[PDB]
Amino acid sequence: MVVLAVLLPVVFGALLLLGLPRALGVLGAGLSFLLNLYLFLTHPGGVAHAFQAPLLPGAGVYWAFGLDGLSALFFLTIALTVFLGALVARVEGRFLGLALLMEGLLLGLFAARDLLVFYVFFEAALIPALLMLYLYGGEGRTRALYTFVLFTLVGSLPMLAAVLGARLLSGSPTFLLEDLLAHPLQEEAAFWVFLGFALAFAIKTPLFPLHAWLPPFHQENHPSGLADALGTLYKVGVFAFFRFAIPLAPEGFAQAQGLLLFLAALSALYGAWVAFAAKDFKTLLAYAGLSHMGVAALGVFSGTPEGAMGGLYLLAASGVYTGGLFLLAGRLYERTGTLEIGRYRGLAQSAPGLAALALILFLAMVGLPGLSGFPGEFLTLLGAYKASPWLAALAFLSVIASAAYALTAFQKTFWEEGGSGVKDLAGAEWGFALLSVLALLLMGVFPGYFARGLHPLAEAFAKLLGG
Amino acid sequence: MALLGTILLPLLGFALLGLFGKRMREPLPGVLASGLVLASFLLGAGLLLSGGARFQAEWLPGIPFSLLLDNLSGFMLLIVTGVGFLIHVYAIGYMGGDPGYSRFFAYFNLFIAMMLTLVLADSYPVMFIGWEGVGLASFLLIGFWYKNPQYADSARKAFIVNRIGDLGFMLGMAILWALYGTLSISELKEAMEGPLKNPDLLALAGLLLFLGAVGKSAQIPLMVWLPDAMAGPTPVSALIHAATMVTAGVYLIARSSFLYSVLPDVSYAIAVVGLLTAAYGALSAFGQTDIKKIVAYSTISQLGYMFLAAGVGAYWVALFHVFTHAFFKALLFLASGSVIHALGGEQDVRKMGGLWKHLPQTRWHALIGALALGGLPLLSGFWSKDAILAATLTYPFGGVGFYVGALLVAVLTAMYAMRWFVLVFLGEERGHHHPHEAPPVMLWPNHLLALGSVLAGYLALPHPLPNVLEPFLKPALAEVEAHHLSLGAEWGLIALSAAVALLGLWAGFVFFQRKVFPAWYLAFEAASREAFYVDRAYNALIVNPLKALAEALFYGDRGLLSGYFGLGGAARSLGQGLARLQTGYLRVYALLFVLGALLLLGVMR
């Protein structure tokens, strides 16, 4: 059931860290992909594989797991992305076990059916990231690590008091989200809990004034960008907003909606804009991920089940193609040795199909229709314009700067005058490119098939902001 | 479902030519592409002749996938497929010894399929899919020979401007979803008539839609991006400037006619912008010293003509101009491409001259084209341009100054067409062309293009003669019409147009054979060569300041992270100030102990 699909990446990461060899982690990630896709099918609903076990009976804590429609496609997204990053990795630092550990942890986190288990995984996922960051590259590694870790922890630890309040002040018997949703928090008490949620989720969303951890984090990781891929998968903030923050304390969110939408719009614009000034790949992609989280936060904060489903779909797909671009940059680094955007211009003539792969990933990035980003982007526009037309309009002076930075980097990196000539493609990169573009096309062309399970949650939790 | 295969074919073709691509011999990509274009033309003509087509497939909740093939859609489909196949053969000829043959024709297949998806659409999201897909393929093909930085920034600026227009489109679409909740032109139109609501919002959605159309067809201010499309191969430039990527703008107005017909100020502004674009292109055309750019500015003027037509409500007349244009501008461009293929790509005017006697079968093509653009009294361009000139006066929104404006524009079009033809074929001899000027399968499809251009013509004729296109186009869509007309005096207007076109032809003849070029004219021609110093301003206060703010906001983020570091440094400093509290003398420790204990006992009350 759900437990096995969640645990498999963790145990395979253990068998990669403590056991040997490197190759078996790739097939472990593949097995995770297969099982998560199977569980994605035949899915009746939330109860799909319900699991209940005691953790702190006296305190009210249970291992609570199951597949939502949201959890299903997020399982699929993570399993696919991590399997791609496992085969093509070339990190080989003997730490891919940490990446599989983080995969399983994020799977359990999305499978969290009770609040405390969500919080537990939210806090536990700090370990892999810091490890694969610290001992696998970077000059200011420890300092950017302290920045990121202190940001997350200062945000998270008061959210523990927030969740204790959400359990106690409502008289909930346990931490189960079902029970906590059955006992809503009252006025002048949901205020503080939602504020604690909004700081901790925004600093990890990330939003504009609190985004300062993302570029230093993404630069100093393993230059292959596996740690960067999984850290980009670590922006799960938006989800916790829609599923946990807003429903559990909508009363304060009613007042804070204007400020949240403002932060989301300004983050999107600022990221997609400053990405132009970025002289390197890690900074550029960090600002891109900030832009995408700004758009997703806009879609969620706007109400408008349209915008909510669009923001979530955009979040999943953006994680996918950003991790793809990180792995692509890591492979071009491994074969060249430098990530500068100016130098090594002729790549396109030497690289036959790596240019087209990078182009497809970039097009999905700037939200070109026919790829997975456009459904969520446009649905978020619609929902935000319903919520606040000004903020959706300003926020969508983004496709311009998006196109600018993406095409500038692609041209100055690949298209221009030939250099020495660089390695063309690796055997693992073959399956990597094939599956990546396959998934992009399938999820962009048929957002009807996917995201159907996202609609009921979105409409119910958006009408919850109504009468 | 059979309607979808027409688009599916130049997807399999693109995938073959992109993935493997160079694993084929040189002529093959053209063969496969031309076969797909012809087998899409055929299956589209068969569907249209069979009455029409409809297809609905599941998509985003509330936003399904709707394809509708009617008279207005099939018209564009036949146009695009025929011109595309002709340019496909001309590219089979013209592309020779150039690597990326498969790249070229895969991009061609993608372009055709996306343009079909655009026009065959009952939902605005699919129209926008086609929009951005066309922008992508255009940006790709302009930079086909990527080894040049000069022909990279062109396509870069192209797609940036395109995405600006597309953002305007997205905002109009969001508006027309918030109001009604349909976003399907069929049901949105059937629901939009009657109780109009928030006329400000309707006019705003129309304004943003027109803004998207301006970026697509390169109108003011987004005008500047089209001339640099000279960078791309010549058959690409023909496909982009004649058959596709420009007709999308006028087609948007043709399909949203139900919206724009109830918006008098909006349609008046559309006519105004069409006139302004026509004037800009005409005035700055002849000053240009390059053949491709001096033709691109004529394209600007002709698209301004079409927008003027569609602005006053002359949607069928604007489509008349589109039909005529699709013929004669393709003729012009393919002529220029054969020309530079004879001279080894010299691609200049001042370095040209005296190609009249040298070139058989080419002087005829270029002359036919120059006459159609100048509006030779007996040619399709004459009918289209003067039908627009009349519809200016007859149709709503006044047409007071626009008539004399477009008439003087006809003068100027004739003048610069004669400048083009003379300075390229007459009045000097320079350069070299020994071996192979005339190709078979290059000038052969150009033969059919020029013939159709001569005989496009009489599908739309003044009311004594048959107006074939009006009854075909009106019933499916663009239903509303309210226009006066006259006879006898209208034919006097036709006579005025013919006389003006002929006088403009001869005026250009003498002015551009003279070589006098008076003091004021030299300054005028120089300014026109530099496009009236537009780009300097465009890079002055917008683009370069965007770069400056990118750099400044990067500095600001650096400062924000430094301020977080300052928070950490304040924490440590406070920490060591509290750590210095432990000096080590026991008397200090006991004093602080007793103080804290007293404080605690005081708090306990």
Write out the DSSP string of A202-225: HTTTT-STTGGGHHHHHHSS-TT-
Cβ atoms of B525 and B511 closer than 8 Å: no
- Based on the number of CB atoms within 10 Å of its own CB, is A435 exposed (0-12), middle (13-18) or buried (19 or more)? middle
Q: B46 Cβ partners below 8 Å, 6+ apart?
A: none
Q: Distance of alpha carbon B290 from its chain centroid, rounded?
A: 20
Q: Which of 450-509 (B) contact A at CB < 8 A? A: none
Chain A nearest-CA distance from B213, in A, is 16
Element (H, E) at A53: strand A51-56
Same domain, B229 and B298: yes
Q: B59 in contact with A at a CB cutoff of 8 Å? A: yes
Residues ≥6 apart with Cβ < 8 Å to A255: none
Residues B565 and B510 in one domain: no
Q: Write out residues 13-32 of B within 8 Å (CB-CB) of A.
A: 18-19
| A448: chain B residues, CB-CB within 8 Å | 57-61, 65
- Residue B66 pairs in a beta bridge with B56
Q: Are A119 and A163 in contact (CB under 8 A)?
A: yes
Q: How many CB pairs under 8 A join A and B?
A: 121
Question: Do B593 and B507 reside in the same domain of the chain?
Answer: no
Q: Which residues contact B198 (CB under 8 A, 6 or more apart)?
A: B179
CB of B218 closer than 8 Å to CB of B246? yes
The residues, any chain, with a CB within 8 Å of residue B208's CB and separated by 6 or more, are B168, B169, B171, B172, B175
CA B272 to chain centroid, in Å, comes to: 18
How far away is chain B from the Cα of A20, in angstroms, using its nearest Cα?
Answer: 37
User: Which residues 560-579 of B have a C-beta within 8 angstroms of A?
Assistant: 560-561, 564, 568
- B164 — contact with chain A (CB < 8 Å)? yes
For A191, residues 6+ apart whose C-beta sits below 8 A from its C-beta are A249, A251, A252
The CA distances from residue B19 to B6, B100, B480, B512, B548, in Å, are 21, 12, 48, 50, 40
CA angle at residue B52 from B47 to B58, to 5 degrees? 100
Residues B17 and B160 grouped into a single domain: yes
Task: Please indicate whether, in this complex, the C-beta atoms of A369 and B557 are within 8 angstroms of each other.
Answer: no
Q: B543 — contact with chain A (CB < 8 Å)?
A: no
Helix (H, G, I), strand (E, B) or coil at B66: strand
Are residue B83 and residue B154 in the same domain, yes or no?
yes
Task: Tell me which chain B residue has its CA closest to the CA of residue A408.
Answer: B156
- Mutation pick from B163, B171, B225, B549 vs chain A, by most beta carbons of A within 10 Å, is B163
Q: Is A263 on the interface with B (CB under 8 A)?
A: no
Report which of B276, B221, B189 is spatially closest to residue B541, judged by C-alpha positions: B221
Tokens of B185: 């032109």
Token representation of residue A281:
């790949």
In chain B, what are the helix, strand and coil shares in percent, each to the nearest 5?
A: 75, 0, 25
Residue B531 DSSP symbol: G
Task: Please name which of A360, A362, A365, A335 lies closest in space to residue A347, comparing C-alpha atoms.
Answer: A335
Selecting from B65, B132, B551 the residue whose C-beta is nearest the C-beta of A277 gives: B551
A145 touches chain B (CB under 8 A): no
- Of A311, A233, A407, the closest CA to residue B161 belongs to A407
| Cross-chain CB nearest to B59 (options A278, A353, A447) | A447
Task: Judge whether B74 and B42 are in contact, CB under 8 Å.
Answer: no
Interface check A397 vs B, CB under 8 A: yes
Q: What CA–CA distance (Å, rounded) separates A197 from A182?
A: 19
Question: Per the structure block, which two tokens stand in for A382?
Answer: 């619609």
Q: Do B474 and B563 reside in the same domain of the chain?
A: no
Total length of chain B? 605
Closest-CA residue to B157 (of B85, B66, B244, B224)? B224
Written as six digits, the tokens of B325 are 């244009």
Radius of gyration of chain B (CA): 30
| Number of domains into which chain B is organized | 2
Give the count of domains, chain A: 1
Q: Give the chain B residue nearest A287 (alpha carbons).
A: B554
Contact (CB<8Å) B152/A415: yes
**Does the beta-carbon distance from B152 to A416 stay under 8 Å?**
yes
A89: left (phi over 0), alpha (psi -120 to 50) or beta: alpha
Residue B379 burial by CB count (10 A; 0-12/13-18/19+): exposed, middle or buried? buried
Q: What is the C-alpha to C-alpha distance for residues A236 and A226, in angstroms, rounded to an integer? A: 17
Find the closest chain A residue to B60 by CA distance.
A448
Which distant-in-sequence residues (6+ apart) come within 8 Å of B588 by Cβ?
Answer: B582
Closest chain B residue by Cα to residue A276: B550
**B544/B521 same-domain check:** no
| Angle value at C-alpha A234, between A229 and A235, nearest 5 degrees | 110
Amino acid at A428: A
Q: Are B80 and B243 in contact, with CB atoms under 8 Å apart?
A: yes
Reading phi first (left if > 0) and then psi (alpha if -120 to 50, else beta), residue B463 is in alpha
Residue B461: is it exposed, middle or buried by C-beta count within 10 angstroms (0-12/13-18/19+)? middle
Give phi and psi for A9, each to the nearest 5.
-65, -35
Q: Is B175 on the interface with A (CB under 8 A)?
A: yes
Q: What distance, in Å, lies between the first and last C-alpha atoms of chain A?
A: 38
- Domain end point (choices B494, B529, B564): B529
B381-to-A237, B217, B262 alpha-carbon distances in Å: 60, 19, 30
Note whether B243 and B251 are within 8 A (CB).
Answer: no
CA distance A63 to chain B (A): 34
Q: Which of A152, A360, A378, A442 to mutate to test the interface with B (most CBs of B within 10 A)?
A: A378
Q: Write out the H or E segment, with its range, that includes residue B234.
A: helix B234-238
- Report whether A111 contacts A71 (CB < 8 A): yes
Last residue of a domain, one of B506, B529, B552: B529
Angle made by CA atoms B545, B549, B553, in degrees to the nearest 5: 175
Distances (CA, A) of B383 to B314, B386, B489, B555: 14, 5, 16, 60
3-class DSSP assignment, residue B361: coil
Cα–Cα nearest to A290, from A246, A362, A238, A333: A238
Same domain, B386 and B266: yes
SS3 of chain A: helix, strand, coil, percent, to 5: 70, 5, 25
d(CA B160, nearest CA chain A) in Å: 6
Non-local (6+) Cβ contacts of A345 within 8 A are: A412, A413, A414, A415, A416, A417, A418, A419
CA distances (Å), B464 to each of A139, B460, B486, B490, in order? 84, 11, 11, 11
CA dihedral sign of residues A74, A88, B137, B102: negative
- Please indicate whether, in this complex, the C-beta atoms of B146 and A274 are within 8 angstroms of each other: no
Q: Interior CA angle at A424 toward A419 and A429, to 5°? A: 140
Pairing of strands B53-57, B65-69: antiparallel
In sign, the C-alpha dihedral spanning A69, A71, A77, A80 is negative
Residues of B in contact with A369 (CB under 8 A): 125, 128-129, 132-133
Residue type, A223: P
**Which tokens is A187 given?**
């006025």
Nearest-by-Cβ selection for A396 from B167, B551, B560: B167
In sequence order, which residues have a C-beta less than 8 Å from that of residue B98 and are 6 or more positions away? Answer: B104, B145
Count the helices and strands in chain B (H runs, E runs). Answer: 24, 2
Q: Do B554 and A274 touch (CB under 8 A)?
A: yes
Give this entry's resolution in angstroms: 3.4
Choose the closest CB to B170 out of A375, A378, A455: A378
Same domain, B458 and B580: no
- Is B147 in Cβ contact with A417 (below 8 Å)? yes
Elucidated via:
X-ray
Using CA coordinates, name the residue in chain A closest to B117. Answer: A370
Torsion of CA B254, B260, B266, B268, to 10 degrees: 60
- Same domain? For B512 and B547 the reply is no
Q: Which amino acid is at B308?
A: L
In this complex, the residue of A379, A400, A407 whose CB is nearest that of residue B167 is A400
Residue A418 contacts B where some CB pair is shorter than 8 Å: yes
Q: Which stretches within A302-372 are classed as H helix?
A: 305-336, 347-350, 354-366
> Can you tell me the distance from the alpha carbon of A134 to that of B299, in angstroms, rounded to the nearest whole number?
59
| Cβ contact B193:B253 at 8 Å | no
* Boundary-marking domain end, from B529, B548, B576: B529
Count Cα neighbours of A20 within 13 Å in the Cβ-side half-sphere. 0
Closest C-alpha among B16, B199, B243, B227 to residue B111: B243
Burial of A179 (0-12, 13-18, 19+ CB in 10 A): middle
Q: Indicate yes or no: CB of B174 within 8 angstroms of CB of A404.
A: no
Three-state SS for A68? coil
Tokens of B465: 């003669």
Structure tokens at B286: 């002849």
B4 and chain A in contact, CB less than 8 A: no
Q: Is A368 on the interface with B (CB under 8 A)?
A: yes
Question: Chain B within 8 Å of A349 (Cβ-Cβ)?
Answer: yes
Q: Does A210 touch chain B (CB under 8 A)?
A: no
Does B538 lie in the same domain as B485?
no
Inter-chain touch B167–A407, beta carbons under 8 Å: no
Alpha helices in B461-518 (DSSP H): 469-473, 489-514
Do B274 and B401 sit in the same domain of this protein?
Answer: yes
Q: What's the gap in Å between the CA of A186 and the closest CA on chain B?
A: 32
Looking at the DSSP bridge assignments, the partners of residue A369 are: A371
Beta-carbon separation of A448 and B146 below 8 A:
no
Q: How far is CA B214 from CA A310, B162, B205, B217, B226, in A?
A: 29, 9, 14, 5, 11
Report which of A103, A101, A7, A106 is spatially closest to residue A49, judged by C-alpha positions.
Answer: A7
Q: Rounded distance, CA B155 to CA B149, Å? A: 10
Alpha-carbon separation of residue B415 from A8, B355, B365, B452, B453 (angstroms):
77, 19, 18, 24, 20
Q: Which of A246, A262, A168 is nearest to A208 (CA)?
A: A262
B69 bridge partner residues: B53
Provide the residue type at A299 as one letter.
G
Structural domain for A2, as ranges: 1-467
Domain containing residue B220: 1-529
Angle (CA) A176-A182-A184 rounded to 5° is 105
Contact (Cβ atoms closer than 8 angstroms) between residue A162 and residue A180: no
Cβ–Cβ contact B136 with A under 8 A? yes
**What distances in angstroms separate CA B260 from CA A177, B162, B184, B303, B307, one per listed residue?**
51, 22, 16, 18, 13
Chain B neighbors of A211, CB-CB under 8 A: 557
CB distance B60 to A447 below 8 Å:
yes
* B549 and A CB contact within 8 Å: yes
Residue B94: C-alpha distances to residues A414, B232, B356 (Å): 27, 13, 21
DSSP A139: S
Q: Tell me how far apart the alpha carbons of residues B462 and A139 are, in angstroms, rounded to a whole number.
A: 79
**β partners of residue B289:** none
